[PDB]
């Protein structure tokens, strides 16, 4: 079984930071050397697992997400980072591992008249929990006056938009971030990856490993039959 990554990575319009998409896929081949052609980048910061080793390691669940930010806060999406752009918008867990990719996106994420489809939050009550998304649009109380009106003095709109123009230089140039998050755990026991092995031999004295037990001997065909639920075979004194 197989999953495509090219359609997962890219979207027609990348969502804003305050509301990001996230896709969870499993039970497919963990081939990661194909994404070099469907996405332009320069870094490919895969901190935990080497890119050439990903073809054999087994992963239970993975997360894929993407979002657009400004170029001044490219490195702010990292564990142990603080700031207004990270604590109230999107912050990584302190034990994060995976592959974070950032690209300078000016040809596809900028307009001469000013692209205004990108949104973030700047005022909020307190720091938010890791991997939590807030989409509420309520006026922040930043003054002694009660913020019961729609807008006014000491009542600031939290959702702030980016102003992007190709005439700008670097730093304020928009960037696109694609994050592939990995985790390693147990219990489903069916989302295991590349554990496949091959080349049975017969009528020779060899070593064998069958789903957990090892042994040494010769293997032959017998005129037995098992019930469809039975797996092992045993006799007197607990011998396979």
């Amino acid at each position: 079984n197989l999953c495509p990554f090219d359609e997962v990575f890219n979207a027609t319009r990348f969502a804003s930071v305050y509301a990001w998409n996230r896709k969870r896929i499993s039970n497919c081949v963990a081939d990661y050397s194909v994404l070099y052609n469907f996405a332009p980048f320069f870094a490919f910061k895969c901190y935990g697992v080497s890119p050439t080793k990903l073809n054999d390691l087994c992963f239970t669940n993975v997360y894929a997400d993407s979002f657009v930010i400004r170029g001044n806060e490219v490195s702010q999406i990292a564990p142990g980072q603080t700031g207004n752009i990270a604590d109230y918008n999107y912050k990584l867990p302190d034990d994060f591992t995976g592959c974070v990719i950032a690209w300078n996106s000016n040809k596809l994420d900028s307009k001469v008249g000013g692209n205004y489809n990108y949104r973030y939050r700047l005022f909020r009550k307190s720091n938010l929990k890791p991997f939590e998304r807030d989409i509420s649009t309520e006026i922040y109380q930043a003054g002694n006056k009660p913020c019961n009106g729609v807008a006014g003095v000491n009542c600031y709109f939290p959702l702030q938009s980016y102003g992007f123009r190709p005439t700008y230089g670097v730093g304020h140039q928009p960037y696109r971030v694609v994050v592939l998050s990995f985790e390693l755990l147990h219990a489903p026991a069916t989302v295991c990856g590349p554990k496949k092995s091959t080349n049975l031999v017969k009528n020779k004295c060899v070593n064998f490993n069958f789903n957990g037990l090892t042994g040494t001997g010769v293997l032959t065909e017998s005129n037995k039959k098992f019930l469809p639920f039975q797996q092992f075979g045993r006799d007197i004194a607990d011998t396979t």
Partner: nanobody, 129 residues
């Protein structure tokens, strides 16, 4: 539905002083960049001054250097444009405008190109004898 309110202006003698004030209702300051643009009858609109988003780098035009000052306070959420030593050619209507981010002089861009998202009604400043 964010409005920008302007106060000041009027009949001022040449050599006098004034202080225009622009207050944001919906948005807050020290997150956007607020500039001033003046327009004369029979002419096209030209910028005056700006303050960037963080801390604030003050930029001034060629004809307004050394005389006009800009300041911003977040306690009253107001930008202040101080007129000193007005000459006779400064009879114009003034508008305050705001754009998100550090719009004023980022990269090869400069705030002469009037593409600010928020605008205002504007106030008239007239010098005469």
């Amino acid at each position: 539905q964010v409005q920008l309110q302007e106060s000041g202006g009027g009949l001022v003698q040449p050599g006098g002083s004034l202080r225009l004030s622009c207050t944001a209702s919906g948005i807050a300051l020290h997150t956007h960049a607020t500039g001033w643009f003046r327009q004369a009858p029979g002419k096209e609109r030209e910028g005056v001054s700006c303050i960037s988003s963080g801390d604030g780098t003050t930029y001034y035009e060629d004809s307004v250097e050394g005389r006009f000052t800009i300041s911003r306070d977040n306690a009253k959420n107001t930008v202040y444009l101080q007129m000193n030593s007005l000459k006779l050619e400064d009879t114009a209507v003034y508008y305050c405008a705001a754009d998100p981010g550090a719009v004023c002089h980022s990269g090869s861009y400069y705030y002469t190109d009037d593409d600010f998202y928020y605008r205002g009604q504007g106030t008239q400043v007239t010098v005469s004898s």
